[model samples]
Target: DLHLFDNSVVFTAEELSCAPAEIIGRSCHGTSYKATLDNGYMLTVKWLKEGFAKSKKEFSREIKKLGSVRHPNLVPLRGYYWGPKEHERIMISDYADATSLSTYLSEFDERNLPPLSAGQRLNIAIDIARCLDYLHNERVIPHGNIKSSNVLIQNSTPSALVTDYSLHRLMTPIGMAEQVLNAGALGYSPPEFSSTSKPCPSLKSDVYAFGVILLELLTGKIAGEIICMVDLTDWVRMLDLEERVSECYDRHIAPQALDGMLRIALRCIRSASERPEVRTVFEDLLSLSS
Candidate 1:
């Protein structure tokens, strides 16, 4: 049995028809339980905390949106249940056999984890960029949170699956106005987000986040350290300034592929006033890879 301090109610595994073995992971917002249905399909049950009614509505909306949409790079929401008595929300989602990009990238050392092949790296970038373009343009929905951790890579392919769509909408009503401000890791956030207090979510913000992701792909370094001196955009600018573009290439990536990806990264990181649209970024990457 688990008890929430504020709620004064005890939640038992049996009450939810879940066992101790079903609990898989836990985070600040909720606890995740891995379960299998009678059909043998697996699912993760995310039990959200109470007290945030607005967050509940947002979570419900996000699930509805995800359930209604189909995309190759997004994890589908299967179903959900909200408890009237326990004041809990349970989100059932697809169980993906993958690790977050953050874990995958962290395993790389100067030599151990080889850089992704040129083709593989480009494909991964395209997958993420396309996902962003879809969420931003096609669906007219903005991913409030974008980061390496939010992206999950399946198997050994150069593909990715995006998670945590719920967080974006959940926090939006609670003063999380600037989506881009929270897109990347601390230093990787674009300058415009901090400079302007506007609540608008732009394709350029997604572009900026993608640029930070590209930086990680290119250099095999966390965006935080590389962009410590300045925001990611300015840091990349410095790289261009110092003629150290080659230095940004991950040791595992092929030399022939570095220039094109670097250029794409630069384009993504351009200032809001100067950056190209999401389609342009997609076209640019496709052209370079093709």
Candidate 2:
């Protein structure tokens, strides 16, 4: 049975379009389509790549738990349809209608990407940390995959929205190995999840990934650059205090925010026991916002 988060949003199988013309983008998950309803409401329909979910029981259990979660930082999961055989998993969520952080950082499509001032960058970082903090609050909802591509924002907005949160919950252990590349081609996926038998997305690793993301926000470089080329946490940690104070932060941010950002980033990069809790990160970020 199909379930809808919003009772007002009428959805039927015939109403979901699959035109090649409606393609929004494709990923390891599956092709996503832009679906517009009769009244002009828009939603993104993401098809789960074949074999991503091993069984209906596996997919059903994880997805139902996900649908029950709600937060400002999370993109709402409005509805879902699971076909019997050929077309089993489709995710319906709010349309971002905005650029992803990856595209914005790369000046994608020559879209006159608006400037992201330091404060805005700080806020986005805080937003992400806050969301992660929430996910980790009662249950450690480790975002197995965290990257700029998953982050969405409106032009010049201080707030950022995280999409694709906890989608890994539906993944079968056999499919985990297919999710990442060896030696950091796709950034780190935690050293522990390399084998097909192990389910990935360690909470510790999520904190480490966030540290790399902090560098992306601060220096305008892709996280991939940090992932493949450098030991980001190590390299950043090595920079002298003065160097980071002077040039590490994006020029648009004030010195105060940089100090706060650095603190959070450094704490995030620390090894397991030494690392501060995600809630601590949230508190620090809120201080910056204050």
Give TM per candidate: 0.78, 0.85
Candidate 2 similarity to native, TM-score: 0.85
lDDT of 2 by residue, 1-290 (tens): 56686676776776665422278887776788878876677888888877777587777778878877777877888888878775567888877777788787767437755567787788889889878887888655777678788888865343688887676677765445455542145455444444435446667777767777777787666666653326545456666444653455544445577677777777776666787777877788789887
Measured with C-alpha atoms, the lDDT of residue 195 in candidate 1 is: 73
**C-alpha lDDT of residue 107 in model 1:** 65
Give candidates' CA RMSD values in order.
Answer: 6.3, 3.3
Model 1 misplaced stretches (Cα beyond 4 Å): 1-33, 49-62, 85-87, 108-115, 156-158, 175-185, 196-202, 226-233, 254-256
Q: Runs in model 2 with CA error above 4 Å?
A: 6-8, 18-21, 138-140, 155-158, 180-184, 188-199, 226-234, 238-246, 251-254
lDDT of each: 0.64, 0.71
- Error (Å) of candidate 2 at residue 48 is 1.6
Write down the worst ten-residue block by lDDT for model 1.
1-10
**lDDT (tens digit, per residue) of candidate 1 on 130-196:** 8777877788776655677777877655378887563545544333443344443444566676676
